[PDB]
Amino acid sequence: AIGLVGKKCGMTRVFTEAGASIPVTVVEISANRITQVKNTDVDGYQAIQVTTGTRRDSRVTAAQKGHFAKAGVAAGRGVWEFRANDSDLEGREIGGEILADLFEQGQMVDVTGNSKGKGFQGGVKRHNFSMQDATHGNSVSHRAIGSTGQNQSPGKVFKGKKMPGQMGNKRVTVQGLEVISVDVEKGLLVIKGAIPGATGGDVIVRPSVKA
Amino acid sequence: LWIARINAGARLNGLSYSRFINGMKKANITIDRRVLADIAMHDAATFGALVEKAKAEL
Amino acid sequence: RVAKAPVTLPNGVSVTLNDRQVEVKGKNGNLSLRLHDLVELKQEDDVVTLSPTVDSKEAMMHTGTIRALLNNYVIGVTEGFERRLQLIGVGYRAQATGNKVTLNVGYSHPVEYTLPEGVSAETPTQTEIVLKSNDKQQLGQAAAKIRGFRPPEPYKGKGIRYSDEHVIRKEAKKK
Amino acid sequence: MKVQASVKKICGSCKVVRRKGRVHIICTAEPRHKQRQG
């Protein structure tokens, strides 16, 4: 259940011989360098910590530089953890490499990403509220929230009431996407589907939990 | 407050408040609860002696 | 009555109570049960007597069931228990192979049932199941579980029935 | 079954049985005589 961190490069299509277009997105996959192995004895849980990408030394702090030098890996742009188990931690030792061959063609994966940020949005866009009458005497409440509760009883707005607020720029997982192709030498993962975020954003690809 | 402190002092010596006060009234001891609580708090051996008198009266 | 009845042990059986755990041994095998803490077990010459500890209705009721279970254990570790099932229906057939039985009753799939440890099935013919067990409770549970896959039906009698069970017969199209 | 406030025997094959504090009528002869109190 360990995965890998990549970069969304954008979407294209893959044509099949039968003449079907498959919408795909391409994930750039620099090698995921193992910076730490966590275990039941020392940490209480089993996980693999990896770094990917690159960071310049002026932007790597002394604490992080010591943490990377302990593993013997070059500092990446970020550090990510993957919940593992005894079978997952089999041959994964500190300083090792995770390449795109962790995934095979045709296999289901889950992709987690940071959604595209819409900023402050009203109920109509954020919660699919119905608009109110464009005409017919409606005064100034075309995109208004409408009623927010009841009368004297309960005399409050309930928690979790759908309202305006920030929308997007959140962690989103799309489940059950298919791996279309894998290229370790090119560092390239082609996945059927949409994959949260904008191109350039960090994405996490993990073997699917539904399967 | 005095009754609470007297109850604690008597239970340290093996008696409850409602038996200790009865034992005092049977022994004809007129010490008030304010003074008894003061003795229980600040003089444990004297309060032990008072408990002994009450317990001999029962 | 039941509790006062003494359990008569044949020459092979040997019940050995040890700290609220009666172990009955015999030729057929070994069975065990927990002695309720309201019951005393006393063993005499080829006879076991159950008694209530403190005389009360509750203790009497509990020693009655201890006595019944012990008697079942003795008779099943000396002779065993046997239940029989019949499969009424044209395409209904059962096949016992080892500790598992495969029933083809009426479904789009055969039903495979694995017997509990303690019960053993065999099919002389293909519409009769014979279960033999060391104890009555597990024999009955296995029989009831096999029967529950396709219980007898009133309109034609089809299904898995016991050997000595009478099935109520309803009439289709009574006007 | 019949779930009612009044459960009694409707024939000589009916039986009154209590389980879990609840009164049942179980009949070996007539399955529509099966009753539960409630």
Binding site: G160 | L1, A4, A8, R11, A37, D38, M41, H42 | - | -
Partner: protein, 142 residues
Amino acid sequence: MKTLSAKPAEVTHDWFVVDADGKTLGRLATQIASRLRGKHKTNYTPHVDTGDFIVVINAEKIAVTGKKAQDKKYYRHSGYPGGIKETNFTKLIAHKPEDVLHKAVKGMLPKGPLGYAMIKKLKLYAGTDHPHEAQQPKELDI
């Protein structure tokens, strides 16, 4: 002569161990609550915490009478509409076994800042071991 208070700096809190194995929940909780409040001390003053530190082991082996294991219900509200959750005594003791005795004692303590202070001294552990051998708690049957 005046009635004096216990002067928090002069109070000492002693450490005791209670084995909860097979004891009645409420009857043990009353004694723990009294000890935590400091009612057994003759310097007891209601605004001062004069209680002891109670360490409780075998907290999962506390007993309830009747059918209370299956029938005593613990509710909570989450703050969201319809958000009333219910657990059982048996399931609570399976899930977070120290919660049962913690709840019993918390209901029996004063409901204020000094009550919050004095329940801090309750140390509950499911199982036979506790980590406070450095405090040398003495065994207290209660």
